[PDB]
């Protein structure tokens, strides 16, 4: 099987939504963020996992594994839920519960 028993990690660059559209076009919405196309790719089983960036020495959740290449091509960027675009809802939900 191609399933890892141990937790995997990978380093990858963020793309602008413009660069991403070159690949996925109109499928890329405002609440989405792409990364990859650099020789690595999120694949089946990674959905829901994090995309983190270091800021002020701390790791910050920037994306949520959402969708990508059919084939998990390492030449195609993966699509992630843009946390920036959704954190107000997160913060409100926590505040109320």
């Amino acid at each position: 099987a191609n399933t890892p028993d141990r937790l995997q990690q990978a380093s990858l660059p963020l793309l602008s939504n413009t660069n991403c559209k070159k690949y996925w076009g109109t499928k890329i919405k405002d609440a989405m963020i792409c990364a990859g196309a650099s020789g690595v790719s999120s694949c089946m089983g990674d959905s829901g996992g994090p995309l983190v960036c270091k800021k002020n020495g701390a790791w910050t959740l920037v994306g949520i594994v959402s969708w990508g290449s059919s084939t998990c091509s390492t030449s195609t960027p993966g699509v992630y839920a843009r946390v920036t675009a959704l954190v107000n809802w997160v913060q409100q939900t926590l505040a109320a519960n």
Binding site: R6, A10, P13, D46, S47, V52
Partner: protein, 131 residues
């Protein structure tokens, strides 16, 4: 992750594994608090699924993990099951996770910060290493 590498155990302390009732991993998630997990809405999580924290190896006979029950699922109402837009869900745990050296929370951004194109970021998971 294709072309990734094994992480140092416990070095991504917010990483969680979501398991169904059969005991199988179907998605990842991240601890943001001792009481909440953020995951994707497309994962279709239910209060039937379990949150596993402090896990490294999924083949362990028994390892020191935390199997946390879910109290409530908060899917974002803006989630579009066709478009896959606004793909976020929050999970409120029945039992708070006990933080340690290996179980901890990730930071959340503000709606206003900018993570510029070209930034080198990191992704983690137990997804396929080859299609």
């Amino acid at each position: 992750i294709v072309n990734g590498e094994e992480a140092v155990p416990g070095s991504w302390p917010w990483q969680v594994s979501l398991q169904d009732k059969t005991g199988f991993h179907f998605c990842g998630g991240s601890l943001i608090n001792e009481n909440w997990v953020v995951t994707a809405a497309h994962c279709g999580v239910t209060t039937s699924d379990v949150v596993v924290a402090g896990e490294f190896d999924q083949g362990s006979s028994s390892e020191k993990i935390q199997k946390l029950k879910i109290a409530k699922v908060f899917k974002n109402s803006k989630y579009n099951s066709l478009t896959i837009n606004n793909d976020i869900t929050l999970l409120k745990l029945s039992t708070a996770a006990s933080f340690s050296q290996t179980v901890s929370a990730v930071c959340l951004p503000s709606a206003s910060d900018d993570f510029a194109a070209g930034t080198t970021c990191v992704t983690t998971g137990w997804g396929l290493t080859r299609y």
